[model samples]
Structure formats: structure tokens, C-alpha cells
Target chain A: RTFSYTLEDHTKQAFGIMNELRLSQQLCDVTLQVKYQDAPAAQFMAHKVVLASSSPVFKAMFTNGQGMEVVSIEGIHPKVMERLIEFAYTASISMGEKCVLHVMNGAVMYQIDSVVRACADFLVQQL
Target chain B: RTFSYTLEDHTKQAFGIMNELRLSQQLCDVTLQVKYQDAPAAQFMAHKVVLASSSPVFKAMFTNGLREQGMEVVSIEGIHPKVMERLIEFAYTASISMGEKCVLHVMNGAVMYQIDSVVRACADFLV
Candidate 1:
């Protein structure tokens, strides 16, 4: 999966997440609930710093909550959300080709631009 | 692989390895030889910020180079991917998921990685 995170967005995130894990080993202090209108979501968890580290949109939401725990997100697919969080925790993700576009859209919806970029690259690779 | 961040690590802000970097895990400044003595050792592309912040050792490794050119051999090995991933996650986000079955492996990994934060946390969990 060619989710190439670089430059403008890459440096900040890499530096941020790694440091978090290294320091207190206490980042990802928040959990997010993913809700899809028509689909059942898989189970997963996340941290405010981790999510915020990757997506600016999420960072703001945390601010709105005033450092709240357990954020609920809507509209993204359950599979995509599951995979995204996996990416959030691990740094890699996978899924069948059948759902690439959907996942890409979900990435855009969630504001994880790197994922959408990967989907785009994968599409080109298929050509 | 995907990623996250803890705001507290750097400038009280946060992020993670994110998608692009994890999926590609390339384009990084260095190719880390994480393949421990374990069979079919895992290979990892590592970055400076994460390593440095997580362990005083890793931090020193990245910093002491002063200007590392590219692809340095990480002397530690023998950790399984499953084990190593969690250790890396712990380094990046201070998070991990494992029962007694796997705790020992990661706890050992913490020592190997020199991530005392993780080592100490696991110390009591396993102790």
C-alpha cells in the first residue's frame, strides 16, 4: 500500500507520534467510536494525540471536547474506520481491492489525506 | 501500517507514524535492521525523531551520527514482528495490547530497544 507520508505532513507526524510513545508511553489517551449510518463497525480504539497527530480535523475535535475521552465519529465505513485506526496504531493497513475506493473516500471523509493518497497511488499501480 | 502521536511528546502537540510513512515505510532517512534473532526477522525503516524520543539509546543513536548518511544497521534483533510492532507502538504512542502470553516478549523487547518507559511499565505488569 503506497501510503507515502512525506514532507509538509510527514515530518510533523513522524516526530510527534514517536516521541509520544517514547516519552511517557502514555499517548493515545482517548478512544474513538466509529459510527456508520448503514454499516456495522468493527471494534477498535485510539488516542487523542495519535489521531490528532495524523489528522488535523481530529485535533480540533479534541479541543472542542476540551480534552475529552472517547470521541464518536460518523459517516466513515466500519471497515475503513477499523483499518484507519489500525494504521493509527501500527503504521500499516490492508484491505481487499473491492473496497479501495470506499476506503479512499473514507480517508477523505475522516481527513486522513495520506490514506486517500495511497488509494490513489494503488489505482495508478493497477494501471 | 499506520500511526498516531501524543501532543505531550513534542511541544505539547501530537501525531503518529500516520499512513503514508507506515505504508511506504520508505523515503525514510534510514533502513533499520530490526530483524532480531527470531526466524524470518522483521525489517523496519525507522526515523530519527521516534527513536530518539523513545529511548535515550535510540535518541542517542540518531543524534550521535551527527549526520548519518543512510541505512544504518540497528544492532538489536530476535524480536518477532508481532512483538516488535507493539514495542515500536509503545515507543511512539505509549500503547500496547497483549496478554501474559505476549507481555514477556514485549517486555524483553523494551529492554532490547532501551525504551525504559516501556521496560518500567512492563516491569510491574509482568512483575
Candidate 2:
């Protein structure tokens, strides 16, 4: 079975909320990957990831903050997706500010998705 | 009474004749003065001069050798006047060659002209 996900506008909206809260340091790691849907093979794919520290100040600010509303996200580019990830990560590490990340492209099966979620959960705990 | 002299072709001819003879070092002094004939009372004027040795080598080069023909001198500027003077002095001093000086503009009827011949005489005597 193949799993897939689409990006929505809430992705950028989350980044905006984070910027307003001034959480610029949480960006520790980022990975970018490009894949084809029908191929079902990871042969012609590209990926890059970076890791850095997560600050505690950012976690406290966003923990009790208002939940972000989901918005429509369509036709976003990979580069924009990378930037949004970086923004949220930075905000997450800064002053416990509320920041959101929306998955923009590609889909991972339960196993891979769980691994990514676990990484996010660990980062949140560090904050 | 006032006397006015215009610089004709002979002025530069004299300089060239001097240069072919290479009497550059003999040019010890030079002076330039600007004047408006209409206001002969000397409203404004500037002058410069220098003196130096005239070698015999340049004099012998041209006098006993070929007598070069005259050349034209028209539409010349004043800035390079000192240069021509130095060239002649150098050539004259180089080969003891023949060199001539022509007065471009002068006001004195009996002005003190330090004859290069006398200077050369003294210089030759020293050698």
C-alpha cells in the first residue's frame, strides 16, 4: 500500500503565526525529498536534511496558544515547502511560540510517517 | 613706446633645430607671461625660468653635420614651451650640436639674455 499527502495553505499561515511570536531559533534539522508517485521506487529521488538545537522558551509560548485553523494549500513548490519547515522549526525553538507545519508534498506509509512524527515529538519535548 | 612680436614658424623651427642637436640640459631657466595688448599697463602676468649646463657633444653633431630643413609651427600651446627648451638644451649638451633659441614674445629692447654660447664657452673650458 502507498500513502500520499497534499499541502494546504495552513502551512504558510502557521509560519506567519510563528513569525509574529518571534520564535526564530527552533530550526534544528530539515530534510527535502523529491519522489514520483507511480514509480513506487525511491531510485530517482533527492533528499537533504539538517539538524540543530531546540530551545525551551519557544515551547512554553505555543503550548497553550490557540490552535491554528486548517486552510486550503495547493500548487506550492518544494522550495517553499522547505522554507516553511525552516520557519516553523525556528519558531518552535524560540520562546515557546506557537508555530505550525503543514505537510506539503509526498506521502509516507505508517512506518515512515510514525518515525517522522516521533522525531517531531522528541523535538517538542526538548522545548 | 610699445613693441609687439608674433610667434611665426621660425619659433618651432628653432626648437627642432635645437632638439636634433640634443641640448636639453642647457635649458636652465624659462619664463612665461600672459598679456593683453589692449591693456599694456601689465594688469596680469606670470613667468618661470631655469639654467643648466650645455654639453659640447650636441653642438658638434648638427653644425658639422647635415643642415636640417625648416619645419612648420602653427596652433601650438604654451604648456610645452618648457619641454622644447629642455629638449634643445639636452641635445646641445649631448653631441655639442647646433641649437637655436627664438624669442616668442618679449617686451624688452635690450633684455638680459644669458647667451648659451658664453655658458658653453665656460663649460667647454672646464672640459
Candidate 3:
């Protein structure tokens, strides 16, 4: 007889744990180089697995080329990338009048539907 | 002036997505090497951030420098190669299946790895 067990909260906890790992920046295997206009590139350390798990675009990039590869992200502001990554880890983002549009753009570009939904809801609230 | 929203099931969804990444074994940053008694070792690909997030033993191993820098391979003891494979899968996906013959072995390895949930699952299975 085969036995099986599945933990319902395991996935939830795993997501939370990954966020902690991101905050600690431990065992990061990918570097994201992102910049805005006229500023030097800002480097962000991340796990390619985490990024891929969160975004289909990242999944394609890593599976296509593969490695602790340094990926350069153009057109998105560094802060936008920062918040996008934060959302990747924590599944939460804080948006204000100042950064919402840029964040929304980044979310749509990355195809992070959760952030896109939250940003849209926030904007709808403002009007 | 900050509007923040946390998606309710995002963590759960991320957990599910990460399982897919583990299945692909793409962007894995760590290797677990396991062997049964007097047998050649088998290798498993994994991510350190995920392992550390799941097990305190793993967290200590990674953080205390018990694992050397520049080395991504970790050889585990007391777990059969088969059991290790299942355990690694569980670490990433929080799910597992086994015949009656190997349940205890998996439980033993889960205890060694300090995975409380797996242990509890095993205990629940036995009782």
C-alpha cells in the first residue's frame, strides 16, 4: 500500500519563507541589473527560481539561457524593480500617488497579475 | 499616503508555482548528494533558499558556514537515496508519496532534516 501526505499550509509557509530569504539575500543565484533614465544601473540580488516561480517572463529567460546569469532590465525604474521584487517575495506591494503608475507599468510588463490587480484597485479607489 | 494590499492566496499560488520550478530543476543553486549503504550516490538538484526556509537544520547548515563557500554540494547521512529524493521533493512542494516499506525511512530522514511538518505527517500516517 502506498502512503501519501500533503500539507495544505506548506506552500503558504514556503512563500513566506522565501520572502525571509529574500530579505536576508541568502544564497541568491541571479543578479538583476535595472536602471532608469540617466542613472547608473542598480544591481539587485535574487534567486532565479523565485523569480521564475513568480513571473512567466523570468521563467522563460532563465530556462532559455540558464544560470546565475546577470539580466539587465531596461525601461523600468530601479524603484519599480525593487517593489516588483518585493511583491514577488511577499505577494504584497505598497503603492502611493508617486509610484503607482510606474509600478503598474512594471507589473504589467512582468505580468504579475496580483500586483496589477492591487494597483488597479488602488487607482479605482482614488477616483 | 501609502496604499498597501496583501493578496490573500498569493502565497499559496506562489508555493504552487515554485513546485513547478522544482520540477523543471532550472535555476537550482544547490545539489544534494545522497547514497544508500555501500551504493553509489545519487544527485538531486535544489535551491538553498527553499531548503533553509523549510528546515532549521538546513538553515543552520547554511548560515553557520558548516557548508563551505564555493561548494554547492551537500552530502546527507542516515537517509536512503530514495528517501532523500522524496524528502527533497517534499521540501520544495510539500507533498510526498511512498509505499509502506519506506515510510519509516522517510520519517527518520525528515526528523534528521528537522522538517517538523513532514514528521507530523509521518506520525499522522502511522497512527
Candidate 4:
């Protein structure tokens, strides 16, 4: 009498929870301090597990047993970092003529392949 | 110009991260102490935001804002530890296996946790 099924909305529910976690900023294990030339420094709260799982760059750094709590990232603006982080959680990003390149750079640096592809597609559609 | 597209694998990525979060048990803010009559207690590590977002009962318990360290330890009663483990696995991954004997037990546990989809899934299995 065993039974099994895949909840079709499982992905939606999981992403919703990820957004909630990001919004609440609860139990965040890592703080990303983002800095860009002449821009006010900004910080983001996130879980190491999520960061590591979502990006190979993050996985290597976080799982290296460094026990790092705060990480410094340079050359990405706060707004761009914000969008990139949001995309990390929700896997969606809004692109604009001015900001899309910045976000695309951030996604590439973070090794979020899907976002990199989306940003490339957005740039191509502009032609 | 401006454009946007949700990464189709957003759900897949989110689910993968959830599984990673569960596996790593990193940034866990709450501990679920599963108890059953005359059985040794079992503990599960979890994030409060995920729990709250997934279950109204958990939402009430965690979002009440007391922030009591005492609130970290939650005792889940009645369900067997093994069954509770599977139920919690479902809470994160939306997939679970129930043997003929424990289907009702898992359903009741899902009902108490206020995870409607799981309850419905278990109900469907009974038919």
C-alpha cells in the first residue's frame, strides 16, 4: 500500500519560502558586504546553504571550511547586488536599459547561469 | 531596453536549494523535538522562516515576536519519529513515501502542521 506523488506546486512553494526567508532575514548565517567605487556600502543577509547551493563560486568559498561569517564583494553597486540577491532567491530579475548590464555582471560573478542567460537574452532583444 | 523572464528552472533551483538547506542544516533557527509514547526523542533542524511560510501553526508560533530562545525548541507530539521525519522531508521537498500502515499517521501529522497540500496528497492516497 505504498504511494508516491510529486506535488506540482512544490517548486512554487519552495521559492515562496525562499522569498519569505529573504524578507524576514531570519537566521541568516552570512552577511555579504557589497562595495562599489564611491557608492555607499551595502550589506545583505543570507543563508550560507542557499548561497552555496545556488552558485558554484559561493559553494567553493563557503564549503571550504573557512567558517567565514562576513564576505566582502567589490565592484557591484548596491541596487545591482540587491537585484542579483533577489534573483538568487526567486530566480527572476527585471532588466532595464541602464541597470541590466550591472545585474548581468553580478550574476556572472556569482555564477548564476540561468540569470546570466536571461540577461544575455534581454540584451539581444534590444537589437 | 527593458525585459524580464522568470527562469523556467526557478522552481527546480529553489527545490534544489531547499534540499540542500535540509541536508546541510545550516542557519537553522528552530529545533523540532519529535516525541512519541515511550520512544526516544528525535530532533530536526530547520529555519523558522521556512516553517512559518509553510505552516500556519508554525507561522503563529514563530511570528508571535517573542523571539524567545525557548521558542527554538518545539515539541511535536503523537507522530512516530520515523513518520515525522518523512513528513518533514515532504515539507521541504514536496515528495515522500508512506507505507500502508503509516499513511494515516503521516496525514494526521500534516494536518496538525497545517500543510494543506500534503494533507490532500495523503487523502488522495487513501482513496
Candidate 5:
């Protein structure tokens, strides 16, 4: 037979797993130290592997174990960071003029193109 | 609309991130001290969240679903780890060249786990 034998959709399940982990409040390592003027000391923790794989900056930083332990950035809204982290963890983003504007910058900062494209696309849909 | 929204394929992207996390070897908290004669040990090492979140079977397996292995280490039943690795990889990437080697293994696991995406995907490949 030229064909092969198999069953089930592991890809969707795998994607589902990734989606679940996005909401998981456990099994995270490392910190994303970001500043929100309203809450300047806020830091978001994440799995370094998650960050590095999805983010160009994180990719470079963690490439050779040559970077700092915590990923610290300045003057971004904690909310914005939260959303971007959501994008990084889940590869999904939503559109909100208030959130999207900030998220756009956040997406660029992390080099998460999917997010950037989403924001851009949403903007395009407006026209 | 001044206020509009957009989307990204979070599931696939997140799966991809997980795959990269495994391949890049940046930050993995848990050890999947899997059994293998000649294997990619570190590459095989993975996040418990990623696994359990993706597989209900794994959810029962780890300490936390809502977490938490070593020795004999990280036992995967009814499927070879490498074969399952391919399954997991397919889950993340949704791309592979099917040879006759592990097709059935993937099929059985997909059905057992109710992974329809892979089940159907493998079916088409076999066909």
C-alpha cells in the first residue's frame, strides 16, 4: 500500500496543550522584570525556555547562557507586558485600541511578529 | 472602527515555542530522565506543563496539571518515546515525512489519547 496507517489529531491536542499552559499559573521559571510607572516594581515570571524560543531578544540573551537571570525592561505598562507575555506564551493576541496600541510596541520589543501582525491586521480591518 | 482587533494562531505558535524550548535547551525546569540507548537526552527534556497541558495522559502522569520525574525515568506507555517524540513534534509542527517506521505507534497513541488531528493526519499520510 502506498498509504500509511494512523489515527487521532495530536497536532490540535498539542496546540491545546500549549493553550492550556498559557493559562497555567504553575511550572514557571525566571522573571520578566518590567516597569509600570503606576507599579514600577512589577515583575512577571515565566519559563525562560518559553520566552527565549518565542522572543528574539530572549533568544539572543539565553542563547549561550550569557544573559542575566531576570529579563528586566523599563517604562512599559504592566498590563502591556502581561498581554505581550500572553502572546509569547500562547501565540495569541486580541485587539483593543487601548491594549493594542501598547501591545503593538510590546510585540515589537519582544520581536513577536505574530502579535505585531495581528495588531497590524486589526488596524487594516478598520479601513 | 477606531477600536478594532486581530488574531494570531496561538495554538500552533505556542506548540512551536514548546518545540523550540526543547530544541534550544534554554530553560527547562523538570527532568524527563527518559530511557533510551542513544538519544537526544537534553533535547528530550521538557516542561511538565507543556506535556501534561497537551496530554491528559500526561496530566495524570505529572504532579501538577492544575504538576510535576526521573529514572526508568519519565515512562511513556503504549508508545516508544522517540516515536511519541515524533508524535509530539507533529503536534507542535504539524509537519513530517511519514515513513513506515512509527506510523502505527502514532496511530495507536492518537486513538488512545483521542488525538483526532494526528489520527486523521496520519490516516491521510497512510492513504
Candidate 6:
């Protein structure tokens, strides 16, 4: 199965909700790039999330599982929370399959995609 | 006065610190873009910070001054803590001067710089 959505719509909608909750300024101008693609059966199963940072503080907090706290810095939105939970569930389901997970910027794009495919495939199999 | 630094060096250094603190994987792949330019007076005194987001929660928490809490998620670095306090002091000192402060993103770059110039100029004048 493939997950399809318009990048612009998703970003704009997410941005609108973020501004409404007063988080626009805290995290600054950021972009969320998500791509879904098909995976071969031989691929490893994994789910990865990549993040960039202006300062060391952002990266440090995020990697330590303090993502929730970082998210809490502005406030919590129900939608965002829902996404996190969903991602977590998906991750757990794919743990037993061929999988890998990582975070990176431009240079690390391939690694991230590889992980995403594996995880998505695993989740699809369960369904 | 102007604050000019290589974006690559700053980002790398900052990223290194964040990864050291275990925040790298938490937030995901993100980028920081900074620019400095000489400004003509009457441009309006302003300082702006831009942040992008992969999710609404990151933005909402940042805009509302929960940045510290977000920072706390990864833990604090003494060196960086000094930077935050310095910014706070600069802000306080510029309160009486002709200064402006705001945050923005790519399209909002002009606005962000305007604020940066005002605040930086004010601080420079005092020095």
C-alpha cells in the first residue's frame, strides 16, 4: 500500500494549526518533507524521522526522547499528538520485520527513505 | 555592527552539540539558514527568528516562549545557556531604543532580518 498526500496541503494545514496554537515562532520557519513510496519484499523494515536544527539545543532535546517536552514548549495540539501516537504504533508493528531507523539532513535522505519504506511495508502487512 | 558567520560552520557546530545531547534523532532532519547584511537607518529596528516545522506541535510551542522547555528536553549546555542569556540581556537593553523584534520563515526573511538589524544595531551602539 502507498500513502499519498499533497505536500503543500499537508504543510499549510499543519502550519495553520501550529500558528493557531502559538508554536509558529518558537520553532521558527521550518519545512516538513514527507514522501511515500513502494518497497520491495527484501527491504529492511524501519521507520525514521529526520529533523534539522538552528541550535544544538533543538537537536539534543529531540534525540533524547524529549520530543514531547519540545512539543510542549509551545503547547500540545490534539492532531499532533495523534500523529505521534500513530507513528509510534506503526513503528512497534514493524519491529519484527526487516527494518532500520535513522535521522539525517540532505546527505542522509536515502537512509531515511529506506527506513520509512521498511516500516510502512511492515505496517501494511499487518493490516 | 554586523553578525556574520558561515551557515555551514554554525549549523555543524550546533548539530554536533545537539547530537551529543541525544537530540539528533528526536527532532528529525531540519536546516538553519542565517544571513547578515549592512542596513540603512530608518529600515525599522527589528529582530526576527525563523523556524520551520515537520509538525504543528513544534511550531506552537516555539512561538509561545516555551523554547526553554523545549531546550530542556535535550538538556542545557553551559556554553549555549550563555548565548540565551545574552540574547535576553540584549533584548532588555534594546527595549528603550528604537528596536523591533519578530520571527519569520523564508518568505518572511525580510521581516526577520529587519528585526535582527534593529536589535543588533542597538546593542552595537551601546557597546
- TM-score of decoy 6: 0.19
- Candidate 5 lDDT at B68 equals 29
In the range A1-127, model 3's lDDT, one tens digit per residue, is 8899988777677777767776777777778888679977788898877888788888787776333467778989888899889878787888778788889999899888878887888888769
Off by over 4 Å in 3: A38-42, A66-68, A124-127, B38-41, B64-71
Q: Model 6, chain B: what is the TM-score?
A: 0.21
Per-residue lDDT of model 2, residues A6-96, tens digit only: 2222223322432332233221111224333342221111101111112122222222321112222233334333333342223221112
lDDT of each: 0.56, 0.25, 0.79, 0.74, 0.59, 0.27
Ranking by DockQ: 3, 4, 5, 6, 1, 2
- In model 3 chain B, the worst 10-residue window by lDDT is B62-71
Span of ten consecutive residues with least summed lDDT in model 4 chain A: A59-68
lDDT of 5 by residue, B11-76 (tens): 555566667767765455555444444554332556555665555655555644323221113554
lDDT of 2 at A5: 19
Better of 1 and 3 by TM-score: 3
Cα lDDT tens digits for candidate 4, B1-127: 6677687766666566656766786556678898899888899987666666567777777766666542277777878898778867776676788688887888888898788888898888888
- Per residue, candidate 1 scores C-alpha lDDT tens digits across A1-127 of 1111112333344444454553443322355567788677554454444565566676566534122256677777777777766555455567677778777887787677667777878779669
CAPRI class assigned to model 3:
medium
DockQ of each: 0.06, 0.00, 0.58, 0.44, 0.30, 0.06
State in Å the error of residue B88, model 3. Answer: 1.5
Q: CA lDDT of B53 in candidate 3?
A: 77
Off by over 4 Å in 5: A2-16, A40-45, A66-71, A89-92, A95-101, A117-127, B1-4, B7-14, B29-43, B65-78, B95-102, B111-116, B119-127
- TM-score of predicted structure 5: 0.66
List TM-score (chain A only) for every prediction: 0.66, 0.18, 0.84, 0.88, 0.70, 0.21
Candidate 4 CAPRI grade: acceptable
| Candidate 4: regions farther than 4 A off | A61-71, A122-127, B65-73
Tens digit of lDDT per residue, candidate 3, span B4-94?
A: 8787777667667777766677666677887778867888877778888788888777766645443377777677888888887887667
Worst 10 residues of 4 chain B by lDDT: B62-71
Best first by TM-score, ranked: 3, 4, 5, 1, 6, 2
